[PDB]
Amino acid sequence: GKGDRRTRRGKIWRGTYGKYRPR
Amino acid sequence: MKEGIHPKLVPARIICGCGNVIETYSTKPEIYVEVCSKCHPFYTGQQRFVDTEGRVERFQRRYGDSYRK
Amino acid sequence: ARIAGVEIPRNKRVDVALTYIYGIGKARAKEALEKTGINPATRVKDLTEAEVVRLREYVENTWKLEGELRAEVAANIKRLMDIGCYRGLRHRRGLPVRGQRTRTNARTRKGPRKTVAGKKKAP
Amino acid sequence: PLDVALKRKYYEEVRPELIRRFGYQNVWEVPRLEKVVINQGLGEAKEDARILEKAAQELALITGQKPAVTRAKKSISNFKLRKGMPIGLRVTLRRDRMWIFLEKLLNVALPRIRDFRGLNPNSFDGRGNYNLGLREQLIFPEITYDMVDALRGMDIAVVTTAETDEEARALLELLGFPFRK
Amino acid sequence: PRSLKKGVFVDDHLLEKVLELNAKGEKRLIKTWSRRSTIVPEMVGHTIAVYNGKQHVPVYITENMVGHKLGEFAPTRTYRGHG
RNA sequence: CGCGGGGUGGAGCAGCCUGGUAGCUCGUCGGGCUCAUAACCCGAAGGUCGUCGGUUCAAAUCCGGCCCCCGCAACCA
RNA sequence: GGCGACACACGUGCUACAAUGCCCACUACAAAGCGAUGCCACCCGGCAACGGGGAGCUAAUCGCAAAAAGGUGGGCCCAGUUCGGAUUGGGGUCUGCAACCCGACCCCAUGAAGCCGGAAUCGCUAGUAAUCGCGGAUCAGCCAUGCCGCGGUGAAUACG
RNA sequence: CGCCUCCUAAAAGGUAACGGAGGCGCCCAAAGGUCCCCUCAGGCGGGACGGAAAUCCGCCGGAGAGCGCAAGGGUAGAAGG
Ligand SMILES: [K+]
Ligand SMILES: [Mg+2]
Ligand SMILES: [Mg+2]
Ligand SMILES: [Mg+2]
Ligand SMILES: [Mg+2]
Ligand SMILES: [Mg+2]
Ligand SMILES: [Mg+2]
Ligand SMILES: [Mg+2]
Ligand SMILES: [Mg+2]
Ligand SMILES: [Mg+2]
Ligand SMILES: [Mg+2]
Ligand SMILES: [Mg+2]
Ligand SMILES: [Mg+2]
Ligand SMILES: [Mg+2]
Ligand SMILES: [Mg+2]
Ligand SMILES: [Mg+2]
Ligand SMILES: [Mg+2]
Ligand SMILES: [Mg+2]
Ligand SMILES: [Mg+2]
Ligand SMILES: [Mg+2]
Ligand SMILES: [Mg+2]
Ligand SMILES: [Mg+2]
Ligand SMILES: [Mg+2]
Ligand SMILES: [Mg+2]
Ligand SMILES: [Mg+2]
Ligand SMILES: [Mg+2]
Ligand SMILES: [Mg+2]
Ligand SMILES: [Mg+2]
Ligand SMILES: [Mg+2]
Ligand SMILES: [Mg+2]
Ligand SMILES: [Mg+2]
Ligand SMILES: [Mg+2]
Ligand SMILES: [Mg+2]
Ligand SMILES: [Mg+2]
Ligand SMILES: [Mg+2]
Ligand SMILES: [Mg+2]
Ligand SMILES: [Mg+2]
Ligand SMILES: [Mg+2]
Ligand SMILES: [Mg+2]
Ligand SMILES: [Mg+2]
Ligand SMILES: [Mg+2]
Ligand SMILES: [Mg+2]
Ligand SMILES: [Mg+2]
Ligand SMILES: [Mg+2]
Ligand SMILES: [Mg+2]
Ligand SMILES: [Mg+2]
Ligand SMILES: [Mg+2]
Ligand SMILES: [Mg+2]
Ligand SMILES: [Mg+2]
Ligand SMILES: [Mg+2]
Ligand SMILES: [Mg+2]
Ligand SMILES: [Mg+2]
Ligand SMILES: [Mg+2]
Ligand SMILES: [Zn+2]
């Protein structure tokens, strides 16, 4: 879910990037 | 020993995860185990596992002495 | 009782099964398998006895798990409580530790509500 | 009798080390193992079931010896206990069946305890006997998680002829009992 | 935490206070307001008076509380529960 | 030391007879409706049964002493 | 230092309780805005936050930029789970004189309540509700899930 | 108001008062017969859940346990299991 930061969905929510949502 | 009330003990081969084999008697002819006494980290002498730390926290919080002497 | 001391559930893929071990999330499940050549899709039921010990050996030796991890987590809380730092008082009285406000929620840390009586109006 | 590794070890290794450790003038002075008594004080099966069966069947697999029922001596209201209710299983292991169980208890069972850090050195009888307690019965190799239905533990009494704790601790460590401290 | 590309933070004025004591055969009672100054190995054995906003609480510093800030040991709010 | 009855959540009453299970109405507290209150609606908490002692595996319940509180009786002389 | 307290109580919201869903990879289609100790292409270090290089743009030109739901392919198979992401341990990053009280982010681990919510109660009549994402003001940073805007997909129903 | 136990009852028996205290009006198909075997309570030390007290082990322990229910007598060289 959007609250799960360790996912490509939660990173979109916080507007941030990481291993779980790279660019 | 009373007749007909006990399970027959038979020669038994016990197999551990460290390729170890034990020749004992049991009610099952061959038993496989994931751990024995020949490899338990307590049994195998000191065998300090993942933790050789102690700790080194905390006074080993060096890096660095970069305040001017 | 297979690896470490927990039986990882059969019928599931091996990568999710290993997560049922305290100390292994999804990313560590990704490692151990790849570092040992076991198809992450293989069902636990369908692993060699050779693959059991190969998966087991690495898992149990690379990182500390179940009981020891809890003992080292407990040791650090205990340490914070012993020295008397502000985090140590939080873990004592049972209040949150990471800056969260307590006027309203904190229920995960406080537990069920303890409803009290309130101040009254005038008729 | 027959050949069990632990027994042959008691004579070959442990007896001479004991004599040279303590100076026994008589060969019957040196400590011996006498019996192993296993106690499952259940009480869950007071009336809630005759689960004593599935628990004696597993005690029978672990020891090779059919357990016997123990019944409540007195009645106890707080315990919900009428005098005579079947509230446990006890089995007295002696001679070779004692060795075979002790041999597996050290070689496979105690290591299978999770967070195992050695047997308590303080649990000696004061008079040379030892007791320990287990919380799971699947610590033993004859028991599998598929064959179990509910976790039951036990008390293990190992009786020796040693007059003192000091002699008995030497007897049990030399045989291979990992003591914590 | 503070980016270790930068140093471990001590307000310097407090750090002088302790290195003089070591040199002169410590220890005096050290009263500071730098609740932020990181506890640093040159402090163990001393006792620093930390201002929590009202008072200077004494703080005896031991080896097992080094990676911390001084304010951690002089709490700022007194509680005692509700009636 | 004439004979009865009674003592249990805050109030008033079950439960005792027949030992194992504390209950009912109001009240009290949190929410709701109302502009607000009451009523009303939704939730919850509070009694180790006057007391000491005994019987029993187990006592509010059964037995004995004490405390307290109401009721009856006290006739022929 | 406190405005961030916490036996409690209420309002407004975010995230969900899953399969019309979740997850990974591939691949499409916006609008309105902002941008000179500003936005940062691309490049190497790093699992990542970021760091170091380093073009272009005083901006219908260069940049923020990837829009997301969607479309395709594959994985999960009804579990308190590959649902959910609170809480907590450890390790870092960055802005800042300074992140103890009291920052945001990233990574390993931890993985709570929650199985659709009592009495009661809110909004919306159409490109509306619902759902998807995007930008701006404030601003060193930011507790923004708030506000002011922006388009994407797109219903049900009105007897009275 | 009949029955049982203890005391009063003055070391045989018996012995009164509106003298001091309790109990009975059942029960058991084994709680009966016999044979064979077994020995308690409690104290302390030891043992997962497990507590003052469940079950287990060692040591001590002549009977203070038990013997359906009052009391007394009796009793493990059994009447107890
Ligand atoms: K008359
Ligand atoms: Mg997830
Ligand atoms: Mg220095
Ligand atoms: Mg796990
Ligand atoms: Mg706070
Ligand atoms: Mg000799
Ligand atoms: Mg045999
Ligand atoms: Mg001792
Ligand atoms: Mg086993
Ligand atoms: Mg002995
Ligand atoms: Mg009262
Ligand atoms: Mg009352
Ligand atoms: Mg009645
Ligand atoms: Mg009744
Ligand atoms: Mg009631
Ligand atoms: Mg009210
Ligand atoms: Mg008005
Ligand atoms: Mg009202
Ligand atoms: Mg109620
Ligand atoms: Mg009374
Ligand atoms: Mg009762
Ligand atoms: Mg007359
Ligand atoms: Mg509420
Ligand atoms: Mg909100
Ligand atoms: Mg709300
Ligand atoms: Mg942006
Ligand atoms: Mg769960
Ligand atoms: Mg639940
Ligand atoms: Mg999950
Ligand atoms: Mg932390
Ligand atoms: Mg801060
Ligand atoms: Mg479900
Ligand atoms: Mg609904
Ligand atoms: Mg309208
Ligand atoms: Mg959604
Ligand atoms: Mg800003
Ligand atoms: Mg916050
Ligand atoms: Mg926004
Ligand atoms: Mg008569
Ligand atoms: Mg009669
Ligand atoms: Mg006489
Ligand atoms: Mg007499
Ligand atoms: Mg006569
Ligand atoms: Mg006469
Ligand atoms: Mg009578
Ligand atoms: Mg008959
Ligand atoms: Mg009889
Ligand atoms: Mg008979
Ligand atoms: Mg004990
Ligand atoms: Mg016990
Ligand atoms: Mg009796
Ligand atoms: Mg009686
Ligand atoms: Mg007697
Ligand atoms: Zn082994």
Does one domain contain both C33 and C67? yes
CA-nearest residue of chain B to C64? B50
Consult the annotation and say whether B54 binds a ligand: no
Q: Label residue B44 exposed, middle or buried (CB < 10 Å: 0-12, 13-18, 19+).
A: exposed
Which chains contact E through at least 3 pairs of Cβ atoms less than 8 Å apart? B, C
For residues A16 and A7, what is the distance between their CA atoms, to the nearest angstrom?
11
For residues C86 and C94, what is the distance between their CA atoms, to the nearest angstrom?
12
Does one domain contain both C65 and C102? no
Q: Is the CB of C118 under 7 A from strand F?
A: yes
Strand order in the sheet with B10-15: B21-26, B10-15, B30-32
Q: Which domain holds residue C90?
A: 72-123
Instruction: List protein-proximal bases of chain G (any atom < 7 A from a CB).
Output: 1-11, 14-17, 22-25, 47-50, 66, 68, 75-77, 81-96, 98-113, 133-135, 143, 145
- Show me where the domains of chain D are located: 2-181
SS (H, E, C) D112-176: HCCCCCCECHHHECCCCCEEEEECCCCCCCCCCCCCCCCCCCEEEEEEECCCCHHHHHHHHHHHC
Beta carbons of D100 and B36 less than 8 Å apart: no
φ, ψ (nearest 5 deg) of residue D70 = -120, 140
Domains of chain E: 8-83 (3.30.860.10)
Does one domain contain both C65 and C79? no
Note whether D165 and D131 are within 8 A (CB).
Answer: no
Does one domain contain both C115 and C64? no
User: How far is the centre of ligand 40, averaged over its atoms, from the C-alpha of D39 (Å)?
Assistant: 55
Between the alpha carbon of residue D98 and those of residues C53, C78, D28, D35, D91, the distances in Å are 32, 43, 20, 7, 11
Of B26, B31, B40, the CB nearest to D111: B40
Interface test with E, best of B60, B65, B67 (most E CBs within 10 A): B67
The Cβ-side half-sphere exposure at D172, using a 13 Å CA radius, reads 34
Of D114, D138, D145, the CB nearest to C67: D114
Does one domain contain both C80 and C45? no
Owner of token pair 């990037």: A17
For residues A4 and A2, what is the distance between their CA atoms, to the nearest angstrom?
5
Beta carbons of B61 and E66 less than 8 Å apart: yes
Does one domain contain both C91 and C117? yes
C117 touches chain E (CB under 8 A): no
Of B59, B61, B67, the CB nearest to E10: B67
Neighbours of C84 (CB within 10 A): 16
Does one domain contain both C2 and C38? yes
Consult the annotation and say whether B27 binds a ligand: no
Note whether D136 and D110 are within 8 A (CB).
Answer: no
Does one domain contain both C1 and C55? yes
DSSP state of D62: H
Q: For residue C86, list chain E residues with Cβ-Cβ distance below 8 A.
A: 71-73, 75
What's the residue count for chain B?
A: 69
For residues D55 and C30, what is the distance between their CA atoms, to the nearest angstrom?
40
Q: Is the CB of D5 under 7 A from strand F?
A: no
Does one domain contain both C54 and C78? no
D72 touches chain B (CB under 8 A): no
Does one domain contain both C45 and C17? yes
Does one domain contain both C86 and C101? yes
Q: How many domains does chain C have?
A: 2
Q: Integer distance in angstroms from CA B59 to C1' H77?
A: 78
Q: Which amino acid is at D123?
A: S
Beta carbons of D104 and B24 less than 8 Å apart: yes
User: How far is the centre of ligand 23, averaged over its atoms, from the C-alpha of C100 (Å)?
Assistant: 19
CATH number of the CATH domain containing C32: 1.10.8.50
C98 touches chain E (CB under 8 A): no
CATH class of D2-181: alpha beta
Between the alpha carbon of residue C108 and those of residues B65, C23, C94, C104, E82, the distances in Å are 42, 22, 10, 12, 20
SS (H, E, C) chain C: CCCCCCCCCCCCEHHHHHHCCCCCCHHHHHHHHHCCCCCCCCEHHHCCHHHHHHHHHHHHHHCCCHHHHHHHHHHHHHHHHHHCCHHHHHHHHCCCCCCCCCCCCCHHHHCCCCCCCCCCCCC
Q: For residue B49, list chain C residues with Cβ-Cβ distance below 8 A.
A: 61, 64, 68
User: How far is the centre of ligand 35, averaged over its atoms, from the C-alpha of A6 (Å)?
Assistant: 17
Does one domain contain both C78 and C61? no
